[PDB]
Amino acid sequence: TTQSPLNSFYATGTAQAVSEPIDVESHLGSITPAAGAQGSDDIGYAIVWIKDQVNDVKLK
């Protein structure tokens, strides 16, 4: 009568990667010496947000 191939069974899921691993927002400052002067000053900072299940980051 009917001979089934016994293959018509399926299960399906989805995957996505919609975000980059890091986000960088800058809060740097300024360097204001006189002409030819020597000095040092703190510039500011830069926030590096870490995204989903990211544990170690290697940057350049």
Added chain:
Amino acid sequence: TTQSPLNSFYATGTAQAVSEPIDVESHLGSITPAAGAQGSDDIGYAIVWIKDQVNDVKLK
């Protein structure tokens, strides 16, 4: 779908040197001897303002 180069992260600051290292203002006087005379006298002074993060100055 989309292959990111992972380069579009930036942080920016500014620098400026808007002033010369020194300012010189003069308060000198006068030399008033007779014709052919020998003497000595104090002339005056000259103020040398020092600008931002300047520590050592070499002048001519």
